[PDB]
Amino acid sequence: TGLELLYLGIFVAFWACMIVVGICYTIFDLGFRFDVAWFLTETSPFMWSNLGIGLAISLSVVGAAWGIYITGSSIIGGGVKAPRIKTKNLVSIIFCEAVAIYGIIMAIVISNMAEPFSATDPKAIGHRNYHAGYSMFGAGLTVGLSNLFCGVCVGIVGSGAALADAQNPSLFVKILIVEIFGSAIGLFGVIVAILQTSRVKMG
Amino acid sequence: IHPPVSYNDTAPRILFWAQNFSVAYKDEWKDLTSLTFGVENLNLTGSFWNDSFAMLSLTYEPLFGATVTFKFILASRFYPVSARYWFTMERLEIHSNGSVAHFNVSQVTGPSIYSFHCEYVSSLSKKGSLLVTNVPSLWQMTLHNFQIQAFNVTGEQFSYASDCAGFFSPGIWMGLLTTLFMLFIFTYGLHMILSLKTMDRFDD
Amino acid sequence: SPYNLAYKYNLEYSVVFNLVLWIMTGLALAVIITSYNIWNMDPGYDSIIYR
Amino acid sequence: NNPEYSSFFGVMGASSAMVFSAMGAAYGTAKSGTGIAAMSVMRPELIMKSIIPVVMAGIIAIYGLVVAVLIANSLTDGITLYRSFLQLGAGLSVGLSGLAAGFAIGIVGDAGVRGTAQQPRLFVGMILILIFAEVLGLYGLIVALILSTK
Amino acid sequence: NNPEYSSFFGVMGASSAMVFSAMGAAYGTAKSGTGIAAMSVMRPELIMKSIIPVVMAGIIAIYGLVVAVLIANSLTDGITLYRSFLQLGAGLSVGLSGLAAGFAIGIVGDAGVRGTAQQPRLFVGMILILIFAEVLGLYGLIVALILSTK
Amino acid sequence: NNPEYSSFFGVMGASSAMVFSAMGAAYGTAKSGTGIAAMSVMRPELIMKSIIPVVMAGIIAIYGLVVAVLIANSLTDGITLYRSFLQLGAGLSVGLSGLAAGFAIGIVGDAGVRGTAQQPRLFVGMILILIFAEVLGLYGLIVALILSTK
Amino acid sequence: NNPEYSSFFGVMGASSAMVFSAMGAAYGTAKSGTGIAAMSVMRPELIMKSIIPVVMAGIIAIYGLVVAVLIANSLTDGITLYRSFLQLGAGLSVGLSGLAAGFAIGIVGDAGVRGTAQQPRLFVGMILILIFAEVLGLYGLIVALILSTK
Amino acid sequence: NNPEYSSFFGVMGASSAMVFSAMGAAYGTAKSGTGIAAMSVMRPELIMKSIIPVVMAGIIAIYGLVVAVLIANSLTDGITLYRSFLQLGAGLSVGLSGLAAGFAIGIVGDAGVRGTAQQPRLFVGMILILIFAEVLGLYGLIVALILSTK
Amino acid sequence: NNPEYSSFFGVMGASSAMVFSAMGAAYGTAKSGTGIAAMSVMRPELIMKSIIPVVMAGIIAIYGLVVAVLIANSLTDGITLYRSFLQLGAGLSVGLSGLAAGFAIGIVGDAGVRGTAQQPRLFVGMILILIFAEVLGLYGLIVALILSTK
Amino acid sequence: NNPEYSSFFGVMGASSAMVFSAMGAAYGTAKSGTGIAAMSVMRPELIMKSIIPVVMAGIIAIYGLVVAVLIANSLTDGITLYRSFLQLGAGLSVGLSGLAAGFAIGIVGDAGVRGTAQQPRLFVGMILILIFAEVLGLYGLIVALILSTK
Amino acid sequence: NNPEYSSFFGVMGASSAMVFSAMGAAYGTAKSGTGIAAMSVMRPELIMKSIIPVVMAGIIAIYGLVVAVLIANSLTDGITLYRSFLQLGAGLSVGLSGLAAGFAIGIVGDAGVRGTAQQPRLFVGMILILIFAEVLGLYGLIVALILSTK
Amino acid sequence: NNPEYSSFFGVMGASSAMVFSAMGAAYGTAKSGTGIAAMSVMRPELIMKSIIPVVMAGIIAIYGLVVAVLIANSLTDGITLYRSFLQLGAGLSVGLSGLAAGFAIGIVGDAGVRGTAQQPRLFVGMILILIFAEVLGLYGLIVALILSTK
């Protein structure tokens, strides 16, 4: 209970304050404040780029860890009464790890796009450079969260497969198709992050 | 209260005020305030105003043994996204007897309906470094509580002022978008670690 | 003021605000969380709760 | 020309398009896959029928991919701010509708395989209920194409 | 004349029409689809009658689609600011009324389908109650049509 | 003369009037449909007579529509902000009163229907407590009409 | 002259008087109708005399209507902030005091009705308790009449 | 002279004095009503005596009202900010202390009446403890009177 | 001369000192009252001794009042910011230490009174514990007096 | 000269040292007092030994008082931010280390006492464990003394 | 030259690398220590083999250490924001990866320890699954070694 | 050149080292002390060995104190932000690593101590896993010493 009330309390108090601020800045005619242009312009392009790089890893690794803990715990729990489980079902672990590898590849590619601007003014930075910062953030967040959800998916269905296999061995190869449809999601997160990255250049 | 400088052409056009106006040449500081505000004989030569450009000009003859003129250069481009005219002081130029020292003015911008106010338009880092020199300079300046308005003025009274300091800054947004992002991540850390449990029993 | 001068809001004001807002939100959450934890603490009177 | 931050909303279009469809397709597949695997122990023959909720949740990932590709191939530093907002609308409109479809597919896929394993006549009903779930991803795609290619 | 960002509200209109109608229809389909799936084990003949909740949840998705298409085809590069807010209004009005209608079609559909398997007479009662659930979508549509064409 | 943002509040009036009344009517109809469905298992005869909680939830949906059309038909470019706040207050006043009425119709509709099966004399009581729930939607209308036409 | 936003607070006052008292009278009606309906199986006759909690819940909504009308008739473009703030205060004062009175009427009405079902003496007691509940809505009205007329 | 917004705090004072004291009085009345009702089955006589916690909860709303009227009479357009903050402080200081008193009267009322029905000697103890609950509002009133008049 | 938005902090001092202390004394009173009530059934004689935790909670409200009064009398139009913050720190320090002592008394009063009815020897242990509980209110007072006169 | 408003953090330091250590000592006392009270029924002799967790909890409040007084004595209107922050950090360092120590003292007091009544040999163990729980407050105090006097 | 705040992001980088990998390794060790405790009572001989998930959780925190040291050795006042954000990237990238890998090692460790105890054929299976979990920490390390040296 | 407000980060450094290390060591101690006192009833001979988790919890607080002193004795008025952020980084880096180690020490202490009473062989296993829990505080220290000395 207490942590749910804390997160709900923060979420409600935050969005209630954004409603009151949104109304108050509107009705007082302060629309020259709330300058989202100022926020996106003066917030450094390096921040967006590096959140993109670090999330492309860490959200993918958070997905793959979630995936490993879920399928690996059923593997071990069923493997008590069915020692055959440990080999065939390891594919659900290898597909979780593939979701992290999709992360690592995409984060290394984004890291190879990061370069020093040597500029501290919005016009001196110029459009290509802001566009790099944002598109690198977006690519990294796209792969990062797509892999997060793919890892949650693969482990879940891998737990399904391992608990079914423990009861009837012939089921494993037939069920295992669902982990392919899971692992497609991470790959689509990679394809989008590739396309978001494909046009950027920092410098 | 010291009376604002009021450039008059058919009507009041440019209003200017400070708590304290000062300058230095070779780091020798002087107070211009009594030489400026409420001075009916104040020399405004070379000043100009237009619908879309403005040039306030303050000339001092006895200052540092030289005729020194201070130019404020202000623009009011329409900005397409914002769809309001936005005032921006572009440059401050110290027209000295020998040459011109150039200062860019940083954050001096606001919506045209409203005026602008700042605690320290200044060349000194201790007072915000809003006046920038890309080259070495013999000059320093500080406008404590600088307030300016240079288009759609009415009467001698300033309109509502946009302040140079809001609830946030670029350094703070970068700070918060890290801290109030990694506190989401630390909360995931804290929610799982606080969800650790132990057995209430052990085996036979 | 007759000239309609500005309210003289200082520089550093975004820093004062992000000190006082986040220090007060930290203190107010530390009070609220602790107060919630002690207010909903188990009073532990199992010897009589059933009689 | 355009402002420097112009491409931010369009980037969040492409990212929302994929991420919320990945969330949809992952929950739709995860939920359905638990159903399929648990069900298959009782009725091992039913796997080749019971994969259909998963293929449906895979189509939601394809909808998120399609719009994210079209947005990403339509991004540039020179983008007008108007098109950049339309690209965000497109990305949310497929992404969150893909998520809405994923939720429905996941819930009805799991109930549908479980029902089907007791009563094989549900299978036609399950396909109809999945069509009415998966078509929300298609409506998200229609609106997202209309926005992203305008 | 108008803010270059003005289209952003009408774009959140088009998205919200679609997204919140999809979330309405998804919940309507998830909830009643679970009901149909469990129900069909006891009364298999009712599959091709009990589908009506799901069909009406699809109609809420259609209301989202109509307004989202209407807004998206009515957006323009230089859109007049109040005409953009009208489009936001239209999009939330149908979108969230669609969500509300979806909530009712979901719960009425699930309860009404299970109830009908217990009680063959309930079918006419369920349909009358589902019309009073689905018409909320239609009122959401009427307001949104009027706003989006004002 | 009049502010740029002025019509946004007028829009939020129309939209809220509809959306919160749809939420109210949806909740009223979801609880009432649950009650009628589970009631009907041992009472065929009541399936028609018991639909009155749903019908009164359908009226809350019309109180939302009426104000939402009345606001929508009065939005325009020149709106002087004051009329837009009046419209927001109208839209929240009917909308959230419709939400409160819908909450009450739901709870009294469920409990009242279940009780009516157990004791048919309850039915006149269920009508009386429902008049007192439905009238909150009417007060919501009265205030909203006054504000939106001041 | 007075700020253009000034009417907003008065309008939110009018809305608040209606909305928060409708929430109060709804909750009071919902709990009271639950208690009445649950009673009826054991005591079919008491369902008429047990309306009184619902009538008092209705009266809380009438107090919020009165202040919502008095505020809504007391509005003009140039309204001074001083007066608009009085109207916001009046609105919240009756509104949330009506909500408070509603929480009381509900909890008292349910427990009081279900008690009276088992104990015919309790009626004479619970009416006094319901009066000490409903008077909160009257205190809220008194402060709202007092505020809105300064 | 004052700024235009000056009266806001003082009005939130007047309203908060009534609102939070009405919430304290509602909570105390709701819990006391539940206790009284639930126990009266075993004790038909104690309903006439066990009203005292309800009366004391009512007295907390009176303490709110007193300050709310004293503040509201002390309002004007020209009010100096100092007196306007003092009125907010006074309003919270009675209002929330009334809410604290009402919590204590609620818990002591419910537990006290239940205990009294199981042991009639408790009645004196309950009255003493309820006075120690009720005086918390009166301390809140002292501070509100001191703040509102200096 | 001195800025306003400065008497406000001192008012929040006085308010907090009364409000959080009254909350502390309320939780102390409420928990103790539940204890004393439930206790009296098994040991009717102990009521007059077992009042001690209620009165130990009672002093917390009074410690709040002392500081509230001291701050409130020390307020003025244009109070020096330093003196106003000192009054805030005092007001919190008593109010929230009062709150800490309120919980401490509530929990050890509820447990201690129950324990004492099962074992009379606990009476001395209970009041010894209530020292190190009630002294927290006193320490809030000490620092609050130091701050209020610094 | 140096910033006004600087006092606020120094004042918050005094309040944090008191309030959080009072919360720590309240938790420590409370949790321990539930232990002592519930234990005493089984072992009426152990009461006077079992107080030591309550005494050590009280000492945590003394540590917070010591720093709070030292801070308050070290405040001035002209306080350089260096001293003002040093006072805030001192305040939190004892306040929250005392809170931590208070958590530990409350848990090991209760567990230590309940164990000790079942086996008197644990008493020395409860003391040794409790010294390691209490010394955290002493470390917090050391850092607070070092900071506030830097 | 560079902005005043510039070095801060690299600092939080160094902190997160140690803190988040500490949390992961702490959880890893706590789950594994619990599994070891529940396992040892039945299979005491097995402990020296069942230490594997603990030592692997300790290795995860070395990956945090290595990066937190590399970042810290790379800090200076004059640091350009590019190097500072690369170092924040290294910080979260090892940090949250180590955190996540620690969660997998903990949960797989607790299972693998309890599983091996009942079935010695799983000891190699637990080692293998944990090697995949450790490699997820190594991926965070690889990118954090890249970024901290870029 | 040096700004004002520089102290906040360095000071929150010192305080966070102490506070979070104290929280860590308080959780480590609370869980271990629960374990020891619940366990030792059956095994008096283990008291003077089962203290080791509590001793290791104390050492985490010492790592906190070391860094908090090392920071507190290296603050100066107008310190550069670079050293000040480094002192924050050091502060958090030990403090939260001590918190993480505190959780691990707590859990291995509770499970390892309670398990030992039924199986003496576990004690040496508990020591080893408890070194792996303790050493995270030491990695936190190593990083914190490094940052605070750049």
Short mmCIF file of N, CA and C in Angstrom, two decimals, chain H residues 29-116:
data_model
loop_
_atom_site.label_atom_id
_atom_site.label_comp_id
_atom_site.label_asym_id
_atom_site.label_seq_id
_atom_site.Cartn_x
_atom_site.Cartn_y
_atom_site.Cartn_z
N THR H 29 -19.45 12.84 13.02
CA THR H 29 -20.85 12.42 12.89
C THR H 29 -21.00 11.08 12.18
N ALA H 30 -20.20 10.79 11.16
CA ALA H 30 -20.27 9.54 10.41
C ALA H 30 -19.84 8.36 11.25
N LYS H 31 -18.66 8.44 11.86
CA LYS H 31 -18.21 7.37 12.74
C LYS H 31 -19.16 7.19 13.92
N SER H 32 -19.61 8.27 14.54
CA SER H 32 -20.55 8.17 15.66
C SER H 32 -21.87 7.58 15.25
N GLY H 33 -22.38 7.96 14.09
CA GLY H 33 -23.62 7.38 13.58
C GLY H 33 -23.45 5.89 13.36
N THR H 34 -22.33 5.45 12.78
CA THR H 34 -22.11 4.03 12.55
C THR H 34 -22.11 3.28 13.87
N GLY H 35 -21.33 3.72 14.85
CA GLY H 35 -21.32 3.09 16.16
C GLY H 35 -22.72 3.02 16.76
N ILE H 36 -23.38 4.16 16.93
CA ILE H 36 -24.71 4.25 17.54
C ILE H 36 -25.68 3.30 16.88
N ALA H 37 -25.76 3.34 15.57
CA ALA H 37 -26.68 2.49 14.86
C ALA H 37 -26.36 1.02 15.11
N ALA H 38 -25.12 0.61 14.90
CA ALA H 38 -24.76 -0.80 14.94
C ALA H 38 -24.99 -1.43 16.32
N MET H 39 -24.86 -0.65 17.39
CA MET H 39 -25.00 -1.18 18.75
C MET H 39 -26.42 -1.14 19.30
N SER H 40 -27.25 -0.23 18.81
CA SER H 40 -28.63 -0.05 19.31
C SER H 40 -29.49 -1.32 19.29
N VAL H 41 -29.14 -2.32 18.48
CA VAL H 41 -29.79 -3.64 18.47
C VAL H 41 -29.77 -4.30 19.85
N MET H 42 -28.65 -4.23 20.57
CA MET H 42 -28.55 -4.77 21.92
C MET H 42 -29.04 -3.79 23.00
N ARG H 43 -29.04 -2.48 22.71
CA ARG H 43 -29.27 -1.40 23.69
C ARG H 43 -30.26 -0.36 23.16
N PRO H 44 -31.57 -0.63 23.20
CA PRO H 44 -32.57 0.32 22.73
C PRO H 44 -32.55 1.64 23.51
N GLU H 45 -32.14 1.64 24.77
CA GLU H 45 -32.18 2.86 25.59
C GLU H 45 -31.05 3.85 25.29
N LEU H 46 -29.86 3.36 24.96
CA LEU H 46 -28.67 4.21 24.90
C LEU H 46 -28.62 5.12 23.67
N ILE H 47 -29.54 5.00 22.71
CA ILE H 47 -29.60 5.90 21.56
C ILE H 47 -29.80 7.36 21.99
N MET H 48 -30.62 7.63 23.00
CA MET H 48 -30.87 9.01 23.45
C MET H 48 -29.67 9.63 24.17
N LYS H 49 -28.84 8.84 24.86
CA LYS H 49 -27.64 9.34 25.54
C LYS H 49 -26.42 9.39 24.63
N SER H 50 -26.25 8.38 23.78
CA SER H 50 -25.07 8.26 22.90
C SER H 50 -25.01 9.32 21.80
N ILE H 51 -26.01 10.19 21.69
CA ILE H 51 -25.97 11.34 20.80
C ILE H 51 -24.85 12.32 21.15
N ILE H 52 -24.34 12.37 22.39
CA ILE H 52 -23.39 13.43 22.79
C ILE H 52 -22.17 13.56 21.87
N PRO H 53 -21.45 12.51 21.46
CA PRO H 53 -20.39 12.64 20.46
C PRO H 53 -20.86 13.27 19.15
N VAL H 54 -22.07 12.98 18.69
CA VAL H 54 -22.61 13.67 17.52
C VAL H 54 -22.75 15.16 17.81
N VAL H 55 -23.30 15.53 18.96
CA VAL H 55 -23.43 16.94 19.34
C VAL H 55 -22.07 17.61 19.37
N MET H 56 -21.05 16.96 19.91
CA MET H 56 -19.71 17.52 19.94
C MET H 56 -19.10 17.64 18.55
N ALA H 57 -19.35 16.68 17.65
CA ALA H 57 -18.93 16.86 16.27
C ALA H 57 -19.61 18.06 15.65
N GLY H 58 -20.90 18.25 15.90
CA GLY H 58 -21.62 19.44 15.47
C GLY H 58 -21.00 20.72 16.01
N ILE H 59 -20.56 20.71 17.26
CA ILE H 59 -19.90 21.86 17.87
C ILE H 59 -18.61 22.21 17.14
N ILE H 60 -17.87 21.24 16.60
CA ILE H 60 -16.70 21.58 15.79
C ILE H 60 -17.08 22.34 14.53
N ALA H 61 -18.17 21.99 13.86
CA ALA H 61 -18.62 22.79 12.73
C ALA H 61 -19.02 24.20 13.18
N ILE H 62 -19.65 24.36 14.34
CA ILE H 62 -19.94 25.68 14.89
C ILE H 62 -18.66 26.47 15.08
N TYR H 63 -17.60 25.90 15.63
CA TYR H 63 -16.33 26.62 15.74
C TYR H 63 -15.80 27.08 14.39
N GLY H 64 -15.91 26.24 13.37
CA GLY H 64 -15.60 26.67 12.02
C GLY H 64 -16.42 27.87 11.62
N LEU H 65 -17.74 27.74 11.70
CA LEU H 65 -18.67 28.78 11.30
C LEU H 65 -18.32 30.09 11.97
N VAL H 66 -18.09 30.09 13.28
CA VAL H 66 -17.79 31.31 14.03
C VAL H 66 -16.63 32.04 13.37
N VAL H 67 -15.53 31.34 13.13
CA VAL H 67 -14.37 31.97 12.49
C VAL H 67 -14.68 32.35 11.06
N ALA H 68 -15.40 31.53 10.32
CA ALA H 68 -15.72 31.83 8.93
C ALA H 68 -16.52 33.13 8.81
N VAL H 69 -17.46 33.35 9.71
CA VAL H 69 -18.24 34.58 9.75
C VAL H 69 -17.38 35.73 10.23
N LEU H 70 -16.57 35.54 11.25
CA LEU H 70 -15.70 36.61 11.74
C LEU H 70 -14.69 37.06 10.69
N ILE H 71 -14.10 36.12 9.96
CA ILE H 71 -13.27 36.44 8.81
C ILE H 71 -14.12 37.13 7.75
N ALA H 72 -15.23 36.54 7.31
CA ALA H 72 -15.98 37.08 6.19
C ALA H 72 -16.49 38.51 6.45
N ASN H 73 -16.85 38.86 7.68
CA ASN H 73 -17.19 40.24 8.04
C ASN H 73 -15.98 41.17 8.02
N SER H 74 -14.78 40.64 8.20
CA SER H 74 -13.50 41.38 8.19
C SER H 74 -12.85 41.47 6.82
N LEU H 75 -13.56 41.12 5.74
CA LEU H 75 -13.10 41.29 4.37
C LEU H 75 -13.46 42.67 3.82
N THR H 76 -12.61 43.20 2.95
CA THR H 76 -12.97 44.29 2.03
C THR H 76 -11.99 44.31 0.87
N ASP H 77 -12.40 44.86 -0.26
CA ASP H 77 -11.54 45.15 -1.41
C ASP H 77 -10.17 45.76 -1.06
N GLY H 78 -10.16 46.74 -0.16
CA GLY H 78 -8.97 47.49 0.26
C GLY H 78 -8.07 46.79 1.29
N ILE H 79 -8.36 45.54 1.69
CA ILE H 79 -7.65 44.87 2.79
C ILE H 79 -6.13 44.78 2.55
N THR H 80 -5.34 45.21 3.53
CA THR H 80 -3.88 45.05 3.51
C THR H 80 -3.50 43.58 3.53
N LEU H 81 -2.44 43.19 2.82
CA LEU H 81 -2.05 41.78 2.73
C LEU H 81 -1.83 41.17 4.10
N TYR H 82 -1.24 41.89 5.06
CA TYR H 82 -1.01 41.38 6.40
C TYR H 82 -2.29 40.82 7.00
N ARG H 83 -3.38 41.61 7.04
CA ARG H 83 -4.67 41.12 7.53
C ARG H 83 -5.22 39.99 6.67
N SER H 84 -4.93 39.97 5.38
CA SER H 84 -5.36 38.86 4.53
C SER H 84 -4.62 37.56 4.84
N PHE H 85 -3.32 37.59 5.11
CA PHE H 85 -2.62 36.39 5.55
C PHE H 85 -3.10 35.96 6.92
N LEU H 86 -3.26 36.89 7.86
CA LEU H 86 -3.79 36.56 9.17
C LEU H 86 -5.12 35.84 9.09
N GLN H 87 -5.98 36.25 8.18
CA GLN H 87 -7.24 35.57 7.98
C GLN H 87 -7.06 34.18 7.37
N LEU H 88 -6.13 33.95 6.45
CA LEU H 88 -5.87 32.58 6.01
C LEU H 88 -5.36 31.71 7.14
N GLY H 89 -4.38 32.18 7.88
CA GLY H 89 -3.86 31.46 9.03
C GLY H 89 -4.96 31.15 10.02
N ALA H 90 -5.78 32.12 10.39
CA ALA H 90 -6.89 31.88 11.28
C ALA H 90 -7.80 30.80 10.73
N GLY H 91 -8.12 30.86 9.45
CA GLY H 91 -9.01 29.90 8.85
C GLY H 91 -8.45 28.49 8.87
N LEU H 92 -7.20 28.29 8.50
CA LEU H 92 -6.58 26.98 8.60
C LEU H 92 -6.47 26.56 10.06
N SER H 93 -6.08 27.46 10.94
CA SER H 93 -5.82 27.15 12.34
C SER H 93 -7.06 26.69 13.08
N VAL H 94 -8.26 27.20 12.78
CA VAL H 94 -9.49 26.58 13.27
C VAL H 94 -9.91 25.42 12.41
N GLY H 95 -9.72 25.50 11.10
CA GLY H 95 -10.32 24.53 10.21
C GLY H 95 -9.66 23.17 10.39
N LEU H 96 -8.35 23.11 10.28
CA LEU H 96 -7.63 21.85 10.43
C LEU H 96 -7.63 21.42 11.89
N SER H 97 -7.60 22.31 12.88
CA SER H 97 -7.73 21.85 14.27
C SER H 97 -9.11 21.29 14.51
N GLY H 98 -10.14 21.88 13.92
CA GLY H 98 -11.45 21.28 13.91
C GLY H 98 -11.40 19.91 13.24
N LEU H 99 -10.72 19.74 12.12
CA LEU H 99 -10.57 18.43 11.50
C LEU H 99 -9.88 17.43 12.44
N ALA H 100 -8.86 17.84 13.17
CA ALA H 100 -8.23 17.00 14.18
C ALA H 100 -9.22 16.66 15.29
N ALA H 101 -9.99 17.62 15.79
CA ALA H 101 -10.99 17.37 16.80
C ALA H 101 -12.04 16.38 16.32
N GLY H 102 -12.51 16.55 15.10
CA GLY H 102 -13.50 15.68 14.50
C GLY H 102 -12.99 14.27 14.34
N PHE H 103 -11.72 14.08 13.98
CA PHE H 103 -11.13 12.76 13.94
C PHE H 103 -11.23 12.12 15.32
N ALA H 104 -10.80 12.84 16.36
CA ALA H 104 -10.83 12.31 17.71
C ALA H 104 -12.24 12.02 18.20
N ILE H 105 -13.21 12.90 17.99
CA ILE H 105 -14.62 12.63 18.33
C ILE H 105 -15.16 11.44 17.55
N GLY H 106 -14.76 11.25 16.30
CA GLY H 106 -15.20 10.11 15.52
C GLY H 106 -14.73 8.82 16.15
N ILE H 107 -13.42 8.69 16.34
CA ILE H 107 -12.84 7.46 16.87
C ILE H 107 -13.33 7.22 18.29
N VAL H 108 -13.27 8.23 19.16
CA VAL H 108 -13.73 8.09 20.54
C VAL H 108 -15.23 7.83 20.59
N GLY H 109 -16.02 8.45 19.73
CA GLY H 109 -17.46 8.26 19.68
C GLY H 109 -17.80 6.83 19.31
N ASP H 110 -17.26 6.32 18.21
CA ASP H 110 -17.49 4.95 17.78
C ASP H 110 -17.04 3.93 18.84
N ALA H 111 -15.77 3.97 19.24
CA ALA H 111 -15.26 3.03 20.22
C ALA H 111 -15.99 3.19 21.56
N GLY H 112 -16.23 4.42 21.98
CA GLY H 112 -16.89 4.75 23.23
C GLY H 112 -18.30 4.22 23.30
N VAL H 113 -19.10 4.41 22.26
CA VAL H 113 -20.48 3.92 22.25
C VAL H 113 -20.51 2.40 22.21
N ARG H 114 -19.68 1.75 21.39
CA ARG H 114 -19.57 0.28 21.39
C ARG H 114 -19.22 -0.27 22.76
N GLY H 115 -18.17 0.27 23.37
CA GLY H 115 -17.78 -0.11 24.72
C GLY H 115 -18.90 0.13 25.73
N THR H 116 -19.61 1.25 25.63
CA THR H 116 -20.66 1.59 26.59
C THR H 116 -21.79 0.58 26.52
#
